[PDB]
């Protein structure tokens, strides 16, 4: 009983995640998480009828996908045509006790799944990790502003898309005054989204919602 083996733990030193709409990294495993570990999140499609999604696996602490370490990329396709947001692409990052990162994307509606396996770097990589941590600390402000702009644009894009769906469904029951007001606000929001002014995007989202209440009633009344 005198002899024994030394107990160690593997920890991820940098967040792990995938690229999502807007070129942003979305984290599935937090920095400083002990191995083994398994995390999953559900994602969906960005357009109606989209038949595939790209899963681009990233490691690092920056907000722009391009500024993190690319670990791998694969597609899940054969997604049958559906409205945006209907597919349920569950993406699971599972790192086993051997440091192997297993990435799965499965459409839970259909059971269709694709996978990749990413091996761990053979030690030592202290300088690489340090350089990535430093790079994120130096740019923490700029990255934060990028992330907030992307989030804002994606929210405006969400409001734009579901409001348009509700107009289309409202059809001729939408009075012309309302139709014109909403359509005009849709255009103004669409223009704000091309900007870099978060306040202006939020202002146009609020103006759109303010003129969309008759619409929501009809939408609610089939």
């Amino acid at each position: 009983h005198i002899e024994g083996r030394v107990l160690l733990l593997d920890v991820t030193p940098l967040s792990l995640g995938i690229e999502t709409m807007g070129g942003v990294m979305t984290t599935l495993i937090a920095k400083n998480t002990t191995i083994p570990t398994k995390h999953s999140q559900v994602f969906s499609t960005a357009e109606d009828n989209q038949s595939a999604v790209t899963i681009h696996v990233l490691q690092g602490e920056r907000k722009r996908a391009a500024d993190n370490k690319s670990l791998g990329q694969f597609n899940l396709d054969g997604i049958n045509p559906a409205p945006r947001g209907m597919p349920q692409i569950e993406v699971t990052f599972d790192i086993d006790a051997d440091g192997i990162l297993h990435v799965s994307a499965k459409d839970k509606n259909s059971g269709k799944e694709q996978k990749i396996t990413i091996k761990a770097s053979s030690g030592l990589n202290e300088d690489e990790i340090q350089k990535m941590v430093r790079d994120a600390e130096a740019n923490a402000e700029a990255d934060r502003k990028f992330e907030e702009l992307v989030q804002t644009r994606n929210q405006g894009d969400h409001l734009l898309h579901s409001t348009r769906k509700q107009v289309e469904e409202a059809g001729d029951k939408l009075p012309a005054d309302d139709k014109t007001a909403i359509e005009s606000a849709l255009t103004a929001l669409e223009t704000a989204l091309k900007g870099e002014d978060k306040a202006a995007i939020e202002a146009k989202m609020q103006e759109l919602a303010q003129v969309s209440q008759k619409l929501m009633e009809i939408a609610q009344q089939q």
């Binding site: 995938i18 690229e19 999502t20 709409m21 979305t26 999140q41 559900v42 994602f43 969906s44 499609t45 960005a46 989209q50 038949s51 595939a52 999604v53 790209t54 899963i55 597609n75 945006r84 947001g85 349920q88 692409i89 994606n154």
Partner: peptide, 6 residues
């Protein structure tokens, strides 16, 4: 659900 592109 965040969104993914092709």
């Amino acid at each position: 659900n965040r969104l993914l592109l092709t």
